[PDB]
Design a protein around this ligand. Structure first.
Ligand code: HEM
Length: 152
């Protein structure tokens, strides 16, 4: 549950992402894959990437980063009223991709890391607080759907 002022912060931060969605999406995925190499094994189309240089050179990885962040931005712009947008993603991630909730924690922290890395000194303590709360809400509502499905 976020206040109006917290949502305003989230959507202000998101404007930074929307100026370069592909660059942000690329770096989020590279941070996930390099920090948590077991996550790479869930992607049949990226498992061939052995080095970070290959990851950086991959245009398909940048494309997927755009898909991921476009979906997240659509959810965030709903300010919590995201049941219709979140349900298909929870279902596909539990039943088809088999993504444990832990990996959604990993990517949430990776988003925070990338924002500080690309905007040092311009991602303030209030903005970090509000973005963190929004990613927690996203993760918590997915977790509820995971429990319904019995997925661990
Ligand atoms: C911010 C969180 C995330 C968002 C919004 C997101 C969004 C999406 C979207 C929109 C798709 C394509 C449609 C679909 O299959 O439902 C996708 C595919 C996928 N997601 Fe996620 N995702 C997230 C996190 C993750 C994480 C943490 C993993 C794995 C560690 C992951 C693994 C996958 C895989 C394996 C695919 C299929 C890729 C393919 O082969 O083309 N996702 N995701």
């Amino acid at each position: 549950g976020l206040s109006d002022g917290e949502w305003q912060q989230v959507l202000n931060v998101w404007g930074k992402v929307e100026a370069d969605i592909a660059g942000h999406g690329q770096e989020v995925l590279i941070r996930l894959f390099t920090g948590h190499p077991e996550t790479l094994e869930k992607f049949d189309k990226f498992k061939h990437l052995k080095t970070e240089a290959e990851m950086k050179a991959s245009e398909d990885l940048k494309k997927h980063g755009t898909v991921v962040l476009t979906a997240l931005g659509g959810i965030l712009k709903k300010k919590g009223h995201h049941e219709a947008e979140l349900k298909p993603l929870a279902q596909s991630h539990a039943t088809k991709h088999k993504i444990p909730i832990k990996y959604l924690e990993f990517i949430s922290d990776a988003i925070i890391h990338v924002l500080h890395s690309k905007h040092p000194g311009d991602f303030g303590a209030d903005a970090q607080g509000a973005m963190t709360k929004a990613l927690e809400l996203f993760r918590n509502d997915i977790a509820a759907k995971y429990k319904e499905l019995g997925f661990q």
